[PDB]
UniProtKB/Swiss-Prot annotation, chain A:
GO BP terms in the entry: base-excision repair; decidualization; DNA ADP-ribosylation; DNA damage response; DNA repair; DNA repair-dependent chromatin remodeling; double-strand break repair; extrinsic apoptotic signaling pathway
Phenotype for R64A: Abolished formation of a complex with core nucleosome and HPF1, leading to abolished ability to catalyze serine ADP-ribosylation of histones. Abolished DNA-induced ADP-ribosyltransferase activity
Name the record gives this protein: Poly [ADP-ribose] polymerase 2
Regulation of its function: ADP-ribosyltransferase activity is regulated via an allosteric activation mechanism. In absence of activation signal, PARP2 is autoinhibited by the PARP alpha-helical domain (also named HD region), which prevents effective NAD(+)-binding. Activity is highly stimulated by signals, which unfold the PARP alpha-helical domain, relieving autoinhibition. Poly-ADP-ribosyltransferase activity is tightly regulated and PARP2 is removed from damaged chromatin following initial poly-ADP-ribosylation of chromatin to avoid prolonged residence (trapping) that has cytotoxic consequences.
Swiss-Prot record, chain B:
Positions carrying PolyADP-ribosyl glutamic acid: E202
Assembly notes: Interacts with PARP1 (via the PARP catalytic domain). Interacts with PARP2 (via the PARP catalytic domain). Interacts with core nucleosomes in a PARP1- and PARP2-dependent manner.
Official protein name in the record: Histone PARylation factor 1
Consequence recorded when altering E246A: Abolished serine ADP-ribosylation by PARP1 and PARP2
Subcellular location: Chromosome; Nucleus
Residues where N6-acetyllysine is found: K148, K195
Primary role: Cofactor for serine ADP-ribosylation that confers serine specificity on PARP1 and PARP2 and plays a key role in DNA damage response. Initiates the repair of double-strand DNA breaks: recruited to DNA damage sites by PARP1 and PARP2 and switches the amino acid specificity of PARP1 and PARP2 from aspartate or glutamate to serine residues, licensing serine ADP-ribosylation of target proteins. Serine ADP-ribosylation of target proteins, such as histones, promotes decompaction of chromatin and the recruitment of repair factors leading to the reparation of DNA strand breaks.
Residues with ADP-ribosyltyrosine modification: Y200
Effect of F242A: Promotes auto-ADP-ribosylation of PARP1
Active site as annotated: E246 (proton donor)
Mutation effect (K269S): Promotes auto-ADP-ribosylation of PARP1
Similarity comment: Belongs to the HPF1 family.
Chain residue ranges for the region called Interaction with PARP1: 204-306
Curated annotation (Swiss-Prot), chain C:
Recorded domain comment: The N-terminal region (NTR) recognizes and binds poly-ADP-ribose chains produced by PARP1, leading to its recruitment to DNA damage sites.
Complex and partners: Component of a base excision repair (BER) complex, containing at least XRCC1, PARP1, POLB and LRIG3. Homo- and heterodimer with PARP1. Interacts (via the PARP catalytic domain) with HPF1. Interacts with core nucleosomes.
Outcome of mutating K39A: Decreased poly [ADP-ribose] polymerase activity
Domain annotation WGR: ranges: 13-110
UniProt family annotation: Belongs to the ARTD/PARP family.
Gene field: PARP2
Function noted in UniProt: Poly-ADP-ribosyltransferase that mediates poly-ADP-ribosylation of proteins and plays a key role in DNA repair. Mediates glutamate, aspartate or serine ADP-ribosylation of proteins: the ADP-D-ribosyl group of NAD(+) is transferred to the acceptor carboxyl group of target residues and further ADP-ribosyl groups are transferred to the 2'-position of the terminal adenosine moiety, building up a polymer with an average chain length of 20-30 units. Serine ADP-ribosylation of proteins constitutes the primary form of ADP-ribosylation of proteins in response to DNA damage.
Subcellular location: Nucleus; Chromosome
Effect of V63A: Abolished formation of a complex with core nucleosome and HPF1, leading to abolished ability to catalyze serine ADP-ribosylation of histones
Known outcome of mutating W60A: Decreased poly [ADP-ribose] polymerase activity. Impaired formation of a complex with damaged DNA
Protein name: Poly [ADP-ribose] polymerase 2
Tissue specificity remark: Widely expressed, mainly in actively dividing tissues. The highest levels are in the brain, heart, pancreas, skeletal muscle and testis; also detected in kidney, liver, lung, placenta, ovary and spleen; levels are low in leukocytes, colon, small intestine, prostate and thymus.
Organism classification: Eukaryota, Metazoa, Chordata, Craniata, Vertebrata
Length: 474, 306, 114
């Protein structure tokens, strides 16, 4: 794709380009880590030829990942052959792999590993959908969030990654899961951790990179990788388009390929949805309120044929996520976790996750005081017969045996006596009350949650535009 | 015993037996003013529930959650002895829950720092440690004989009652194995943890980086700059919500505590949203009451009899 | 005190800046046979002809060998370049640049070439 030049080479950012030849783009990033000996270092290499004058150069820059480091610019006055030689020689020295056949890369212990990078207007639409698309399709905000994913929360310091790089990361998490499952904290565990930290760049400052020892860190790493994938899909979706759009967002909307229609505030549907939002605000999430500003009808192509209409127990359940990634869902729908992803990160397995209490799912929006706009999606989910779970058991999926979804039994939850109906789907109104489920052996889940596995059992139905209103801070 | 139940009814807390035995000890040392029996010698004062023991509460609105509650005394911490009022040096029993006995006696200097230093597991240990440390701090020899005599009485009383005099006892080292994190106060958190490690998870930020976050926020030059700078607190609070929803209550317990330790009024509300709730989720309702009342009225002068 | 020919990335196209006593070009050496230290360090400020556009060259290593080098560009302002130069000289010698005349070799720091 679009090949960017490292901006840090100020002497060449505007007069020079990264070299390419078909497949082979002479740009590469290497990472190494060995917690046994506490190495965690990167090495970027880029061949740049000037645009204006015929002159090639090799740029190298190295240091601890996150902390910018020592750089070198070697000019050649157009000696492309020597420069390419130097490039390949250094690549081999640092990797033990030849550069030209980069396709068949094999990392070796005690050497750097490679990684893979991404380097007449009649705007006819309802004004409300226009505001929605402009909100979610704001490329500036996506860039700013990506920059925050490097300098605010150091999860991806050096840059972005590819889908396949994420898949290799998942492979390493699988190896970590296998290792940890046997509770052995010796040498193999340290090497597996080395492989993880090699594939996904982290910045530990100086404190020896710690061993991944419990399930919580596994799941956190998994969520980090998921956020990486989300950013990747969001930037893939926001690709701009030409051909007389007179409002490029209309093509972006086609890319959503999902009808989203404005609803009137006085319609039964709007009022009932507001009732459901308000009645189900958990009392233990009282640091903020939420107001329903607007509500949009959802019609996603292909989902109708897939819905398990035959299955009973159909209810409308929440799903929250940050303002930016929603563009992906509306174009592709919700997906089960990556198969290559370790099962043991999900205390009750993979699949699609929903709540019936607005604030619990709403916590996954990460709205802010400065940025007070968030979205909650409502979907009709045919749960069918639920399997009842008292205590965490990541293996819930084997226990289904004919059931179609899992229920995690929370202390606080609405009782079916208050349930209402919307278009023949069950709407589980609150308030939450005690459910008389308790555990005389272990802990008790704070709140119920429902998980489905077949993607065909979800049908998105309305998208909620929500003002999160925070309060006094001191 | 007949004067004990009114004491413990006032505080809604149970006090260990060494407290009352030390009251009897100080009574025998000085019947006229047992609480201050060590004040002429050591410059220390018996306060708090000893105030009830002294009947000095009979002059009187009386809020015992704030009585000698210094600016950085966490709700777990019940002040029982006062020293230098210049540094607000003080010693107090430390209880993790209103239904348990104190785990040890800690000391803090509220005008100096927020750190609570263990000082034995009972008031005998705490006063002996202070006495021994001062004995070298005192630049004199003639004015020491009194301390040797009072210390002799301390040692004989502790021996007779069967109390260890070590600064860190066996039970404290056992609790330390149950201590999940220090949380800027250094005294440790005790939270329920089941066999699946459910009950606690660590903060998304390191302690040093948390202190740095507090410094950069509190030093912001305008409210707009703070709101822009507030993003990490909002994020950490959202993740705290996530954790509490999954029964890892102690995380929300810990974050508020750090803000409680930081001391800025800009954090009074957010801590009041985090710390009481966490105590409610943990069924420590009295601590929620204490933190509500303290955050609403957190003063630098706290003797309720004035 | 010639401009280093070994600075291929800069030779030919610029003139080193100096001012009388204060010559912003210098080579320092440190030999110490106890620790087998024998290292040099050249520093050179270079000015553009067209605009006030300056560069700081540093080069260091074991005597004779080019070792390593760094280019810090200061197209912004020459005063920044003086800051880098003088501050680094102090860091490396414990002697100020204005007071460079009265040099006293402290152990383990650079002396210059007389």
């Amino acid at each position: 794709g679009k090949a960017p030049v490292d901006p840090e080479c100020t002497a060449k950012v505007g007069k020079a380009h990264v070299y390419c030849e078909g497949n082979d783009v002479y740009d590469v990033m290497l990472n190494q880590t060995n917690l046994q000996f506490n190495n965690n270092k990167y090495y970027l290499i880029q061949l740049l030829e000037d645009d204006a004058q015929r002159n090639f150069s090799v740029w190298m820059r190295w240091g601890r990942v996150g902390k910018m480091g020592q750089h070198s610019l070697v000019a050649c006055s157009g000696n492309l052959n020597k420069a390419k030689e130097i490039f390949q020689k250094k690549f081999l020295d640092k990797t033990k792999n030849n550069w030209e056949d980069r396709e068949k890369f094999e990392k070796v212990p005690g050497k750097y590993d490679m990684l893979q990078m991404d380097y007449k207007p009649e705007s006819q639409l309802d004004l409300r959908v226009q505001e929605l698309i402009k909100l979610i399709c704001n490329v500036q905000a996506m860039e700013e969030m990506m920059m925050e994913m490097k300098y605010n929360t150091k999860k991806a310091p050096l840059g972005k990654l590819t889908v396949a790089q994420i898949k290799a990361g998942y492979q390493s998490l699988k190896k970590i899961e296998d290792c940890i499952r046997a509770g052995q904290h010796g040498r193999a565990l340290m090497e597996a951790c080395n492989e993880f930290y090699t594939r996904i760049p982290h910045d530990f400052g100086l404190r020896t990179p710690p061993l991944i020892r419990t399930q919580k860190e596994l799941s956190e790493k998994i969520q980090l990788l998921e956020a990486l994938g989300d950013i990747e899909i969001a930037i893939k979706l926001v690709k701009t388009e030409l051909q007389s759009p007179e409002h490029p967002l209309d093509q972006h909307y086609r890319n959503l390929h999902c009808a989203l229609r404005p609803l009137d505030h006085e319609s039964y549907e709007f009022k009932v949805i507001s009732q459901y939002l308000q009645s189900t605000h958990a009392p233990t999430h009282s640091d903020y309120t939420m107001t329903l500003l607007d509500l949009f009808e959802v019609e996603k192509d292909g989902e109708k044929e897939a819905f398990r209409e035959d299955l009973h127990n159909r209810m409308l359940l929440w799903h929250g996520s940050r303002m930016s990634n929603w563009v992906g869902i509306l174009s592709h729908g919700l997906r089960i976790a990556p198969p290559e992803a370790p099962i043991t990160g999900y205390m009750f397995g993979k699949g699609i996750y929903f709540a019936d209490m607005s604030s619990k799912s709403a916590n996954y929006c990460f709205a802010s005081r400065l940025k007070n706009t968030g979205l909650l999606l409502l979907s009709e989910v045919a749960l069918g017969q639920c399997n009842e779970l008292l205590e965490a058991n990541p293996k819930a999926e084997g226990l289904l045996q004919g059931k179609h979804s899992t229920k995690g039994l929370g202390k606080m939850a609405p009782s079916s006596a208050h349930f209402v109906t919307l278009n023949g789907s069950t709407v589980p109104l609150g308030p939450a009350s005690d459910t008389g489920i308790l555990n005389p052996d272990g802990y008790t889940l704070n709140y119920n949650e429902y998980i489905v596995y077949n993607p065909n059992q979800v049908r998105m139905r309305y998208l909620l535009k929500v003002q999160f209103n925070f309060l006094q801070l001191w | 015993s007949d004067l004990r139940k009114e004491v413990e009814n006032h505080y809604k807390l149970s006090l260990p037996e060494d407290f009352y035995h030390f009251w009897k000890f100080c009574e025998e040392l000085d019947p006229e003013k047992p609480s201050d029996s060590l004040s002429a010698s050591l410059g220390l004062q018996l306060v708090g529930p000893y105030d009830i023991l002294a009947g000095k509460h009979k002059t009187k609105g009386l809020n015992f959650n704030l009585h000698w509650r210094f600016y950085y005394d966490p709700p777990e911490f019940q002040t029982i002895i006062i020293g230098d009022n210049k540094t607000q040096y003080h010693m107090g029993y430390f209880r993790d829950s209103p239904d348990e006995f104190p785990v040890y006696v800690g000391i803090n200097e509220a005008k100096k720092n927020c750190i609570i230093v263990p000082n034995g597991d009972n008031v005998f240990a705490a006063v002996k440690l202070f006495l021994t440390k001062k004995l070298k701090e005192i630049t004199d020899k003639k004015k020491i004989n009194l301390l040797k005599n009072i210390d002799e009485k301390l040692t004989e009383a502790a021996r007779e009652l069967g109390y260890s005099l070590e600064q860190r006892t066996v039970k404290m080292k056992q609790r330390d194995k149950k201590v999940v994190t220090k949380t800027f106060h250094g005294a440790g958190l005790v939270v329920p943890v089941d066999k699946n490690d459910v009950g606690y998870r660590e903060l998304p930020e390191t302690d040093a980086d948390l202190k740095r976050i507090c410094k950069t926020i509190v030093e912001a030059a305008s409210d707009e700059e703070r709101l822009k700078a507030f993003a990490p607190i909002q994020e950490m609070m959202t993740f705290v919500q996530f954790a509490n929803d999954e029964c890892d209550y102690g995380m929300g317990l810990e974050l508020g505590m750090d803000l409680f330790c930081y001391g800025s009024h800009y954090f009074h509300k957010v801590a009041g949203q985090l710390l009481p709730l966490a105590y409610n989720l943990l069924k420590r309702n009295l601590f929620a009451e204490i933190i509500e009342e303290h955050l609403a009225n957190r003063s630098q002068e706290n003797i309720d009899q004035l």
